Symmetry: D3
Subunit: 267 residues, 6 copies
């Protein structure tokens, strides 16, 4: 009957609800395993640490992929990048335990030098095909005024990896050695300015801040004077829109809307 | 112009009198246009209705296809080389149904279209040879466009248009006897900020047949989702144009693609 | 506290005013030396030439960095790119004298071929660490409909250079030969469509246009017929928002807002 | 070793007692080998006779083909995608005639095989999965070799062998449950400094049939030149081996591919 | 026939003489048009200037392809690379007139930054397909102890261009706009240490040295003190092997011997 | 008088001895400061450790440049690359003290991923211009059967850096921040198969082996069973040619012979 619809608003509701079976009310329905893709050690916990704790509490398996080693993130002239990499691995392991996270994949690209290349797509696809996750969380590459190249590259690479994982001609040696081409059901953008889904983290906010603080190298007492207020202000910003004190915002869309969809921004 | 102190007046004066910019009939004196598609099918899905309307009015429409479409199957039994051959026949078939006779294949692999000087030169070489009056290309600023080939194609196409008239750009082209060429017209399809509309209500059924010609891409089960999707897109452009089904284009003066802070105000 | 606040609007005002000590009213307070980063010879003067004259008059040292040689910017079949590069160096030297500008750094990347690479980041960091400037002006890489690759690359590279200059592990050979990490106090985006700060250039507009016209290769009489009205229309656009006739618009944000800040666009 | 003061003595002692290097029977403990070919046909042209002799003695021989062979025709009617499909069937046919069952296709385009970390990882992934005892690869030091794919394949293959055993190299391979692997044997084919020879006089006619299986590459007119060429190569290795027709290999200890100034002395 | 040969030496003589019809005595039999590919302005004249004069005298059309602009080749702190490029264009034009050379193609890659890429192969193939030359002269990329990256890249790129020009699937847009595949009959390597063919240049040596000296920027009086003796010593080295005073050495092989030929070094 | 020589052998002797003033008998005459360029931590000491001790004993300043971090060089699954980098820095510092070496520059490129790029050339040129060394030692990039990409790249990059350091248009920002072009007097290739100069290390051989063994991560007891005999066999190979027990072999040529010299291999 779709041929004889003459109003956009009607066709849109019909496309989302009946054709795509898209659900914003409970979009995590049948997800048991999710990947969180972080550009740097700490990005997962700062972006969506509260939501990760809430997920592992409900018995959802949450696995980290860390794109970089975090080699550059110190102003101390006494800490070489190799020293800092070891330090931030221990820190992210510690931070991961406090939320329910057991498994981390390290790609080991150098901080500030994450290529936007076919090579990094293949590395991510290899992990998606092995772990066969139901959902993937990744930073929104369209975050206005995001100046960090690793953040822009990670978001775009992660969306490519999700879209190309189910194509048997993409990185075909993966299938030849016995991995299978996998479709992810769910995509969530964190660190986003246009969220359409909210998780209340008011009850776990104190644990989130403790798990951020586990990154001692990144949050000495002097830096923390600025960041505790910043992180609370972010949590309030998502909070206003969710009708709670403290929240984490996600943008969830159907796979289809990430390609040639001029009304994609209308959810 | 020295004596104007209000922006709104200077803006109307710049568009109307200085630039002589015309949204009412922007295809006035265009006889030949290039449609630049990242993949086989992108031209017909994006602006197939408009292409039929153009070739009917006797305008020559030439495709440039950036990639071979090697990756676009979930069938483990179709190699990329097999699929490339298949999608060439499909786009040839789809092209005949609209009035399109000439296709240039650059043969970059699907998902691996470089954003490089090299692909700019390939496009400039075609622009200088064919001397087209207008170029259609996908809007690289489409919100939430995740396909790298789509982003790269839009940016590369705008670069090619801007650099084709510069004799120092790809100078070997001139040494073997091509000439610099200036394009009159730029149109962005697959856009979320269109400012010009073509009614395709009368040709919508032909457009869908010409999309369906890409059998590899639209089996019956996929088509269950895509017919409604493509109709919903056509309705979205429709609402803004005051018809049922439309294709949206963004048209701006060449000048507004560079250091223009009010570019989004047309 | 900050724990006690449960309204976003309050936390936001508190974060800007008290935590970050951000001041839009006089943001150039303690800046004595600034770098202006231009993709092409002429971009500084066209973008913010009026502001540069006002700065050098008040005794602020303004230093240009030019990313490219301007090799491609002619339609004359008789002028090779090497010829035009020499010509536009003389032109930018001439244009620079008319405003108060004495020092220009030429990176000498070819027009239309400015890489977005670690290599160009190092080149810019080397200059920032040597000159120890208090502020940096650079083109807004998020300018809607900016099709020139050199403009997009320059803005992103400049923000990276500013962010990485203070990191001792970034381009470590710089410190080994006796340069020091440097933190830039001030970042200003010119050629922007979301300006939040304005400089009146009504009094110096005629000098700005003379200094643009000094680029003879780029502004013959026929081209100038279009560009004088264009440049006046731009100056009026910033003008309306500033409550003057002719202005230059800048976007100024705290350094923190260029990373994972979902309300960045809300100043 | 401390109290040796003559090079010639220390050299014999290093090879025989320390490294336990054996040129007389170097395939002692090899059950599985990879043959790495830049193009479809390179394995059979380079060492087809040796491959037949190996599979007859029950050794598993697995091909890795780096490229699709997209460029290797002067026929204006055959697109590269068409030719790729054709040369896959041809190499499958040629592979059956020798004892070869498994081919891995990397699907890099002919003439565009990068010398990159990315292609190293692709090869390491296969070496770690298949755990082969030996690897055959084209000698990248072949004088006057003009083909970039041949130079890149040889260097990449030696890198892959050297880096496969390092757990920090392509660490995601181990995280998903592959293991580091050390290859026991390295053989260079298409070499001008061979130190080991296989008699192929008895299987020469089968080798030529298996080369000819690549019809796209060896029409009757091309074959007029190549049968004599391939015979002349086989005679060149022959003279040095004391038979009519041979295939020459260079075998060295893994150690001699790094900072060994007397490497050329075996 | 060839099946019943049991001697390498016999099959080798038979392959060269009868099958390949290879002729070292007069290898320039049917060549009317040749390309000389030089990495830098001056490389053609220094390498084979004498041979070029002897060729243009006999009415052979000799066309230069210059890969780079020669931007880096001065120790003078006052001469920008753009200045030097203009200067070395005039110099090579002057040097070219003195030998019989009328047409030079400038690719305009920067000195020291000549990529070994598909892109430069396409540029060279485009010229080979347009000019349809019978022969190509290029520097021997296997020259022992050649440290200049532009020299190594030029030799390899030139051999690739020759090998790929006849393949319709290589740079297919060239054919779509109406160029045709072209097969080059003749390949000569200059600047080679394993030459197998010699041209007597004793009678034109003084003109060669004048045409080298035309590159004033490259050969001031002090540099020339070293280079006149060097260039004479090179000419004597080729001379001894040719049985004359002064010669230019070339390596000529069948096209076949540049691919999987283990006895290639045996001519 | 060079015009009226008619024999190569005579011109060759005359060019080396009188024109170039090339001296193999005492080639380190006026060198007080040398750079040793090593691809990996340990390459300097394994290649020419004995010669380094003999140089620092005579009061010559020897400065290391290490291209890579040595991240990949372990088969232990429990040592991350970041851990191993820290470990091999301490090891090379220890090994350096035992020979007379005080100063090491770390470029910090990852083991196995040393680019052959303009970027690494600039890094090396920056150090050559700052330290103004009289000589440079680097691994022979033409070593037959060298399979390590870092070894091939280091040798070529080092020769480029030496050749481009004196060109003011190469890496021009170096001069703008106050470094000067520098000419290196001396180039020595170690890890070479065609040496023409030898240093007796018989008396310091057991110190060299101790300084190699300082790299504990690289030489456990089991690995050392193979390498002590290997390193002794190498030292004997150079030994035979020098008429001593244990030696280190170097190739020294005039700078001129690294460009378009067909008789380069004839010294
Ligand atoms: Zn981060
Ligand atoms: Zn597409
Ligand atoms: Zn035209
Ligand atoms: Zn500009
Ligand atoms: Zn400072
Ligand atoms: Zn091949
Ligand atoms: Zn194993
Ligand atoms: Zn040169
Ligand atoms: Zn032809
Ligand atoms: Zn004089
Ligand atoms: Zn090493
Ligand atoms: Zn100096």
């Amino acid at each position: 009957m779709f041929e004889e619809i003459n109003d956009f608003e009607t066709a849109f509701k019909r496309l989302l609800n009946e054709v795509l079976e898209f659900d914003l009310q409970n979009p995590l329905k049948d997800v048991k395993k999710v990947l969180c893709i972080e550009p740097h050690p700490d990005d997962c916990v700062i972006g969506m640490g509260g939501t990760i704790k809430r997920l592992t509490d409900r018995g959802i398996e949450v696995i980290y992929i860390c794109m970089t080693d975090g080699y550059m993130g110190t102003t101390d002239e006494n800490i070489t990048g190799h020293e800092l990499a070891q330090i931030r691995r221990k820190e992210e392991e510690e931070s991961a335990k406090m939320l329910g996270v057991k498994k981390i994949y390290w790609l080991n690209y150098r901080d500030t030098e994450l290529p936007y290349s076919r090579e990094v797509r293949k590395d991510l696809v290899k992990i998606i095909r092995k772990e066969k996750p139901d959902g993937v969380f990744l930073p929104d590459p369209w975050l206005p005024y995001e100046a960090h190249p690793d953040h822009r590259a990670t978001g775009f690479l992660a969306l490519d990896a999700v879209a190309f994982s189910p194509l048997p001609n993409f990185s075909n040696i993966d299938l030849d050695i016995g991995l299978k081409p996998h479709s992810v059901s769910f995509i969530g953008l964190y660190y986003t300015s246009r969220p359409n889904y909210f998780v209340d983290i008011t009850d776990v906010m104190d644990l989130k801040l403790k798990a951020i603080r586990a990154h001692k190298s990144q949050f000495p007492d002097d830096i923390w004077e600025t960041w505790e207020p910043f992180l609370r202000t972010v949590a309030l910003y998502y909070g206003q829109k969710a009708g709670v004190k403290y929240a984490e915002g996600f943008r969830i869309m159907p796979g289809l809307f990430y390609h040639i969809t001029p009304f994609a921004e209308l959810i």
